[PDB]
Structure 1
């Protein structure tokens, strides 16, 4: 693929040899790049930019030039926008085919559900150039599933809908009220707050029961056994699954016939099954070489038997996570972040 080569050339040019160590501040975190990274901005600030350019031409423009961090952000938005435009439907189709095949096989799981909301595409539309919020989103989804276990309905579903709504608002700001624009921005700065004061670093509250790493790092089958364990039945199981550079979530909630087993990859979406067997099938084939091979694409390490392992699995304490307050001096909890509005009742402009 031309795209894969070009997208890798582009990537190299963002982590450059003027600060070799993967210890120096990455440019995607900087205020200048992040101000740059938005639609309709390269045409204002980048000499030689034209909107009819291909990806390859944009990446040529990027690597040949002498650019400020802001100019780099604007070009990054244009390159990433087009790259996601070329790939995201292919990828979604692939995830859906695996879901539907498992859901439909043998005895159909009539309660199986999928909701796709690919974060990279929605965050690019939302003019957020940080490069992903898999960790904040995974944590918010685990809180949502704690809340749903205790009886709230559709909390994770609505978080994901609100990502769509924020992306509609932020990409087309003049169509919505000032209040809606402020709402969308506030949703996204909440993800950033969670990253800035990550509750796993918080020693005054313990949001986690157990961290499984290094020596006792879990395989995919280990995650499956923990989620589908009948000993739990009644109680929520809430795991955060950490690859080296990407976070995901998995859960069990509900009792008896309302018990559901779910998985959230922020890059794809949420799936839930009522069948434990089907949940196990999905996760195995999602990560497994034999099928979607996400274990390789998220670059999981291996144990001595050569099986893929997560860097870390966190067994979450949901009620404590729910009450965590990511910003000092602001009462809003993880649950309150889930409840933030985007659209409100004002008719569209």
Structure 2
């Protein structure tokens, strides 16, 4: 089924083309026929120095797939499959990037897809994925690269394609080493309307509506093992803006997504590869992860290094206020250098608040990784056994190396989600991740976006200081099951699972003496799902009430994980665990609460705060 593929041949090159609409759609999608094939003479002159492997032609599914293979350098034996984007030839797109791998001693396979360069055929989505695999099958069979220490690379469109290939390789047991989404197209539809302006309704939107669900990175990645390292590097233009939106979706879903947003334009290959080549080639193996774990626990030491109510501190807790009145501090410094700026000359009540925001805003991004594998293992064990669950989700929700606030909110969301709205729990997390990236690199993103993130950050802080349970103006709870009316572990499963209500939400808050957790039920009939948020173990939902019981008991009890003992909560009369307190909460009351006196944004308004303006 997967034999050798090399084949030389020397005719001129074939084509497709159809009905005059679909022609000047295909032109819009993939580039004009001539533009696809033009190789510029300066490149050809350089490539005509295949005088020191260097030229390639493979048997594609609809014809020949021409291109070039590029050797390593003067001196640890690995290759970059390069999948090119639309608009130009593979030789032109690669010419800029082809050198930065070369000099490190990395090979690269730059092969054209159907309809590009000198390759036979006409561009087609199902076909372009097929041609990508041909290039892959040239690397392992024809040139026998070791199982897989190869990276995909990964481009505008090359991205969606790269994603698809990476899934096929894994599914077929030839699992590739790394994926690189280099300034990628999130989806064809969104790639069109981004480079064009806003959201027109004429032809540009008719094309977009036509090409819906084509070249979708998230859609092509579903199937890929989540451990597979993905490096996602975005441009500074509107395709990055949609790329960073994607990044968050991919992070929360749980893919191994690294990288940042660049400040380079979508066509600026040489400048981007100029900076990121090191980070890219250090991005395909696993220590690596040890080397950033070390620098990770670094800032964990510096958090242990580390008034909240007093009016002076709150006057200084905001963006760009430290840069005026606190000397010694630059805006480009690390947390290591900012926390050291705290302990040099130690400051007034207002100046301490100014550094607090500046430190805790950088800190937000560091809350999301890591997560201990046991919690992922336990989630996978529950989905595996029995009738596998359709809506079994898992979200990397921020773990606040610092809950108190999130746990209040996750419940607000599920009320809203029960009332017909949907995804807002998931969206909150993404927006928190997005806001982190914005605050943790302030220069890149706009004045407005820096401002919006510091409002979501502010709202989280305001819930931290002023709790709804510690409040008298309204009552956000229905009842408090504590004392000898306190619920057992299975007692929480019963209130959540009991279907004597089948159209209403069950919004619990599970209070251990250290950490404060939550759990819920929403939905109608088939859609009815039961869920649980732990601060330092992410979120899980299941639509099978039995699978919820399996997880939740294995989470706390001795059967598997035994996280009850470790979460330091006392035993009941028979000798089992019972939470300190268990709040059955009112969603509508809680959703109307405002954390700041003077500000009119409610808990539901906090959920719907923007981060990226649009």
TM-score, with normalisation over the residues of structure 2? 0.43
Deviations 1:140-199 (A, max 9, x none): 110000000001111110111112112111111111112111111111111222233322
Contact 2:509–2:518 (Cα < 8 Å) also in 1: yes
Question: What SS does structure 2 have at the residue aligned with 1:88?
Answer: coil
Measured in 2, the distance between the counterparts of 1:157 and 1:242 equals 23
Q: Identify if the C-alpha distance between structure 1 residues 120 and 144 changes in structure 2 by more than 3 Å, giving closer, same or farther.
A: same
Contact 1:248–1:264 (Cα < 8 Å) also in 2: yes
Contact 2:322–2:351 (Cα < 8 Å) also in 1: yes
Q: Identify if the C-alpha distance between structure 1 residues 331 and 69 changes in structure 2 by more than 3 Å, giving closer, same or farther.
A: closer
Q: Identify if the C-alpha distance between structure 1 residues 289 and 201 changes in structure 2 by more than 3 Å, giving closer, same or farther.
A: same
Contact 2:361–2:436 (Cα < 8 Å) also in 1: no
Q: Identify if the C-alpha distance between structure 1 residues 65 and 185 changes in structure 2 by more than 3 Å, giving closer, same or farther.
A: closer
Measured in 1, the distance between the counterparts of 2:563 and 2:338 equals 29
TM-score, with normalisation over the residues of structure 1? 0.72
Q: After TM superposition, give the deviation of residue 255 of structure 1 in Å.
A: 1.2
Q: After TM superposition, give the deviation of residue 73 of structure 1 in Å.
A: 11
Asked whether 1:79 is paired with 2:359, we answer: yes
* Paired positions, count: 313
Contact 2:569–2:578 (Cα < 8 Å) also in 1: yes
Partner of 1:51: 331
Contact 1:118–1:268 (Cα < 8 Å) also in 2: no
Q: How does 1:293-308 map to 2 (within 5 A)?
A: 293-308=562-577
> Which deviates more from structure 2 when the two are superposed, residues 336-345 or residues 141-150?
336-345
Asked whether 1:222 is paired with 2:520, we answer: no
Query: Any stretches of 5+ residues in structure 1 without a counterpart?
Result: 8-26, 122-133
> Which deviates more from structure 2 when the two are superposed, residues 266-275 or residues 142-151?
266-275
Q: Identify if the C-alpha distance between structure 1 residues 177 and 258 changes in structure 2 by more than 3 Å, giving closer, same or farther.
A: same
Q: After TM superposition, give the deviation of residue 243 of structure 1 in Å.
A: 0.9
Contact 1:39–1:171 (Cα < 8 Å) also in 2: no
Q: After TM superposition, give the deviation of residue 81 of structure 1 in Å.
A: 13
Query: What is the root-mean-square deviation in Å for CA atoms of aligned residues?
Result: 4.5
Contact 1:6–1:59 (Cα < 8 Å) also in 2: no
Q: Identify if the C-alpha distance between structure 1 residues 297 and 313 changes in structure 2 by more than 3 Å, giving closer, same or farther.
A: same
Q: Identify if the C-alpha distance between structure 1 residues 89 and 342 changes in structure 2 by more than 3 Å, giving closer, same or farther.
A: closer
Q: Identify if the C-alpha distance between structure 1 residues 237 and 36 changes in structure 2 by more than 3 Å, giving closer, same or farther.
A: same
Contact 1:248–1:265 (Cα < 8 Å) also in 2: yes
> Which deviates more from structure 2 when the two are superposed, residues 293-302 or residues 80-89?
80-89
> Which deviates more from structure 2 when the two are superposed, residues 287-296 or residues 186-195?
287-296
Report the structure, 1 or 2, having the larger helix content: 1
Deviations 1:218-268 (A, max 9, x none): 121111111001112111100011111221111111111010000111222
Question: What SS does structure 2 have at the residue aligned with 1:175?
Answer: coil
Q: After TM superposition, give the deviation of residue 209 of structure 1 in Å.
A: 0.7
Q: After TM superposition, give the deviation of residue 331 of structure 1 in Å.
A: 1.9
Measured in 2, the distance between the counterparts of 1:228 and 1:120 equals 29
> Which deviates more from structure 2 when the two are superposed, residues 41-50 or residues 255-264?
41-50
Q: Identify if the C-alpha distance between structure 1 residues 277 and 341 changes in structure 2 by more than 3 Å, giving closer, same or farther.
A: same
Q: Which has the higher contact order (CA 8 A, sep 6+)?
A: 1
Query: Any stretches of 5+ residues in structure 2 without a counterpart?
Result: 1-299
